[PDB]
Write a protein that binds this ligand. Sequence first.
Ligand SMILES: CNc1ncnc2ccsc12
Length: 164
Amino acid sequence: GTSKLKYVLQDARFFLIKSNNHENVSLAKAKGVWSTLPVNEKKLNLAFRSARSVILIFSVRESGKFQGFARLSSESHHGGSPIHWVLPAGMSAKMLGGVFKIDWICRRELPFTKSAHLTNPWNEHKPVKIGRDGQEIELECGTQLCLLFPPDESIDLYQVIHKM
Ligand SMILES: CNc1ncnc2ccsc12
């Protein structure tokens, strides 16, 4: 069903994640972690304090798809086990040192062809598939893009609902 999903998405904030590789999204799906550059780290730390839910919607560059979406369950932290990211060119471990804990809500893919009717008022009304890493997605466009994903029946949102 979609009832607990809508409950999670109520008054949430949505951020677009553009990973440069599939490997790190894979790693993020396994370990429930994500790291971004300092500029977006600050943005997500600020958003986590400000909304009942901060939703990250993932898309690997040049895949033509979103790969799922997840909920921030913490602010970033530095000093844990060095998460073996496939560092992208121009990025160092120090830059990606801030680690957000996340609870996945859907690990299923959604092809861009299916979100062509959705545009983002915070990105000049461009199709929601278009945007840099960190682009915030406006409440209604974000909500509807999430509802477009196939249900991920392996996930039980009771766990995520209580942290709210
Ligand atoms: C784990 N962090 C990342 N992995 C792959 N691509 C990007 C782009 C900005 S952060 C990031």
